[PDB]
Write a protein that binds this ligand. Structure first.
Ligand SMILES: *[C@@H]1O[C@H](CO)[C@@H](O[C@@H]2O[C@H](CO)[C@@H](O)[C@H](O)[C@H]2NC(C)=O)[C@H](O)[C@H]1NC(C)=O
Ligand SMILES: *[C@@H]1O[C@H](CO)[C@@H](O)[C@H](O)[C@H]1NC(C)=O
Ligand SMILES: *[C@@H]1O[C@H](CO)[C@@H](O)[C@H](O)[C@H]1NC(C)=O
Lengths: 325, 48, 38, 224, 49, 49
């Protein structure tokens, strides 16, 4: 009863005459409505992880994934992960995910890092704002002889630092010495292009880099959507955006490219449906503060409850069925 | 230090999943067979 | 009419500056009504 | 083709132009600060009338004041050779097709029809849509940048009663995004595919003003 | 001459957390920080009366 | 604000990162929002005098 919560908040057994703020008031949601896009065509992850063979480190390639529903339990069919944890990768949505793959030495799985390399500073640079997941795959069983595949070369020095996501296909030798050269060798003018020396553990990795601040979602997940119910406090999930509030109609004037809608401050006030394409108005359900009015435990045990800031038509009418929270 | 009751559990895993099993992790065994606790105080021992 | 008040103490429900209630910042009304002060 | 006539860069002023939507979030009756790459107010832009190869230092604002459709598109890419998937814009007055191919460039391009190059290769991106172009009188503003992964495009089309030479019209008009091309190329140089206005973007903090409908009515350049 | 002040109440859990998250279980490790502030705010609320 | 974390929305850090590495990024926001509330209560107790 509110008298015992007045006792617990005051940390005493006798309550004097007055009004005391004990706790708050929050209406709990009922539904668990999720709304995902309509697509059913799966993601071709078997073309990313498996091919005839892979590509080089400086002659790299990023495979684009669009209009697909991804799956990551089938990713372990044949693994440290940055940013998004893989246990929540089965229910998140994005716009586009890049899949760039390169080949490295077995002693080179440690150098390549967003904020930490040697070969990377000159062959493949990765940006600092990284979100994505790397695949650790050994290929000593796949490629170990005197000449496995001669489509792979690498260079260990360049003239300056490399920006992220940069490729150089210039057929030109480089130098690191003092005298200028053009084709001819001499005082530190030799070739930088070195072939891989396979002998008996090359590491062939695949980086699946995600995004941030997503657009209207083109890719999606295998989780199935639910119907839309209005005018009550609903725990919603719109394209990965979690929250709880009443999904009332918008009566707004959204531009045809906008899907997010905000208040004066940072508050997710309006959203657009991924399937209905109808804008809504996110409003949190009824809440407030509670103050208990007790005349004193030395006189009586009756209490008066004042829910601060609410109307009298917002109190729960199921006063007998409040045990199920 | 002194403890309440030490619990020793033995299992045989692969060579790629000695760190894949973790507090709150997924993959092949961390979400489908076994789970290290979220408030897990103690240790794991992996060897060859 | 010359003191433009911007308090958030009301019961009523495009949004005004009183959207700070949704972040947990409410305004309690005073005990003495302005008619009683007058 | 070697069509070459006699070629002096002229200059004019941007009368509070170059403001776009930095995000797709609807705001209403609020003043919002944005630290992104915008065009500075009252800046010297290169008014041509001409096709040189201009740089692409982290963003280029573009405008066009024409009555007919004598302009047709742009070409982007750091190399003038058949590599690094150089981008192309084209229009045939019924659809706005855009291609990202690996062709080697020519001297003087024209699209009135693949005469802007001489070797087709293994293409990368194809996209056909009725937006990306709408077809003196007609204004056609554009902002191109290739930050953080993909390629941004903003545009707006307004009528003009102001004269043709040396006059970018004053007033405010917000540039709305059409499509965010997920290409990811590295651009250093660019030129057009034939008014003419080119302005370069700088990182600058702005102060936008949203109305009750959500359109940007005015802006404040916080370093002017 | 001024006389009174606008009485403000602060919901600590709805400000620190977002009333839809498991943040409320992590706020109990501090204990008496959300009660001292509302006590000082109730003091101002009765002081302006 | 972020207070040196990856995001301000708690529903993104909870639904993206891994449970035992969230007790720093959703500790920085909690300490920042506690310091902001203490600062607000402090200047209100100052200006109430
Ligand atoms: C996903 O598919 C559904 C199913 O067709 C689309 O819903 C239709 O939307 C149009 C207008 O957008 C309505 O005229 C139809 O009545 C809807 N069909 C149903 C069964 O409700 C939805 O628009 C699609 N979403 C996207 C983003 O393409
Ligand atoms: C409470 O709700 C009723 C009906 O919904 C309405 O008539 C009344 O004006 C509301 N109270 C206040 C103080 O606005
Ligand atoms: C907003 O839209 C309404 C009708 O769509 C229009 O009457 C009004 O003028 C618009 N506001 C502005 C500032 O143009």
């Amino acid at each position: 009863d509110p008298l015992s919560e007045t006792k617990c908040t005051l940390k005493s057994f006798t309550v004097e005459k007055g009004i005391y703020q004990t706790s708050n008031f929050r209406v709990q949601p009922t539904e668990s409505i999720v709304r995902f896009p309509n697509i059913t065509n799966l993601c071709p992850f078997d073309e990313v992880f498996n091919a005839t063979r892979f590509a080089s480190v400086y002659a790299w390639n990023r495979k684009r994934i669009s209009n697909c529903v991804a799956d990551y339990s089938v990713l372990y069919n044949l693994f440290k992960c940055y940013g998004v944890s893989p246990t929540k990768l089965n229910d998140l949505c994005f716009t586009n995910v890049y899949a760039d793959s390169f080949v490295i030495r077995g002693d080179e799985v440690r150098q390549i890092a967003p904020g930490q390399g040697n070969i990377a500073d000159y062959n493949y640079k990765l940006p600092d704002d990284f979100t994505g997941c790397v695949i650790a795959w050994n290929s000593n069983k796949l490629d170990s002889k005197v000449s496995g595949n001669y489509n792979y070369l690498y260079r260990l020095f360049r003239k300056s630092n490399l920006k992220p996501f940069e490729r150089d296909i210039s057929t030109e030798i480089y130098q690191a010495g003092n005298k200028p050269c053009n084709g001819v060798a001499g005082f530190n003018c030799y070739f930088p292009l070195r072939s891989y020396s396979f002998r008996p553990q090359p590491y062939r990795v695949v980086v699946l880099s995600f995004e941030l601040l997503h657009a209207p979602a083109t890719v999606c997940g295998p989780k199935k959507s639910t119907n839309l119910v209005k005018n009550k406090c609903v725990n919603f999930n719109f394209n990965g955006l979690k929250g709880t509030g009443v999904l009332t109609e918008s009566n707004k004037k959204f531009l045809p490219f906008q899907q997010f809608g905000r208040d004066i401050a940072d508050t997710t006030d309006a959203v657009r449906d991924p399937q209905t394409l109808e804008i809504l108005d996110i409003t949190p359900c009824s809440f407030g503060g509670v103050s208990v009015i007790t005349p004193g435990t030395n006189t009586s045990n009756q209490v008066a409850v004042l829910y601060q800031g609410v109307n009298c038509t917002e109190v729960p009418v199921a006063i007998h069925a409040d045990q199920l929270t | 230090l002194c403890f309440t009751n030490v619990y020793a559990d033995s299992f045989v895993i692969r060579g790629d999943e000695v760190r894949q099993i973790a507090p709150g992790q997924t993959g092949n065994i961390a979400d489908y067979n076994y789970k290290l606790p979220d408030d897990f105080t103690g240790c794991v021992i992996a060897w060859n | 009419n010359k003191v433009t008040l911007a308090d958030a103490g009301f019961i009523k429900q495009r949004d005004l500056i009183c959207a700070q209630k949704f972040k947990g910042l409410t305004v309690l009304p005073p005990l003495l009504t302005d008619e009683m002060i007058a | 083709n070697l069509t070459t006539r006699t070629q002096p860069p002229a200059y004019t002023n941007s009368f509070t132009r170059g403001v776009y939507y930095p995000d797709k979030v609807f705001r209403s009756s609020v003043l919002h600060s944005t630290q992104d790459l915008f065009l500075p107010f009252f800046s010297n832009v290169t008014w041509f009338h001409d096709n040189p190869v201009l740089p692409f230092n982290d963003g280029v604002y573009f405008a066009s004041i024409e009555k007919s459709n004598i302009i047709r598109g742009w070409i982007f890419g750091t190399t003038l050779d058949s590599k690094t998937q150089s981008l192309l814009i084209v229009n045939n007055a019924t659809n706005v097709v855009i291609k990202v191919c690996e062709f080697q460039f020519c001297n003087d391009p024209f699209l009135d029809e693949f005469r802007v190059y001489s070797s087709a290769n293994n293409c990368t991106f194809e996209y056909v849509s009725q937006p990306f172009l709408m077809d003196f009188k007609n204004l056609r503003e554009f902002v191109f940048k290739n930050i953080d992964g993909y390629f941004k495009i903003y545009s707006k089309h307004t009528p003009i009663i102001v004269r043709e030479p040396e006059d970018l019209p004053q007033g405010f008009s917000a540039l709305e995004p059409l499509v965010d091309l997920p290409i990811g190329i590295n651009i250093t140089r660019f030129q057009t595919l034939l008014a003419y206005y080119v302005g370069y973007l700088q990182p600058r903090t702005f102060l936008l003003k949203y109305n009750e409908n959500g359109t940007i009515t005015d802006a404040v350049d916080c370093a002017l | 001459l001024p006389v009174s002040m606008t009485k403000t109440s602060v919901d600590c859990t709805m400000y620190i957390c977002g009333d839809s998250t498991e943040c409320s279980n992590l706020l109990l490790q501090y204990g008496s920080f959300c009660t001292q502030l509302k006590r000082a705010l109730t003091g101002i609320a009765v002081e302006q009366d | 604000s972020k207070f040196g974390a990856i995001s301000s929305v708690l529903n993104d850090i909870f639904s993206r990162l891994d449970p035992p590495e969230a007790e720093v990024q959703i500790d920085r926001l909690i300490t920042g929002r506690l310091q902001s509330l203490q600062t607000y209560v402090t200047q209100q107790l100052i200006r109430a005098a």
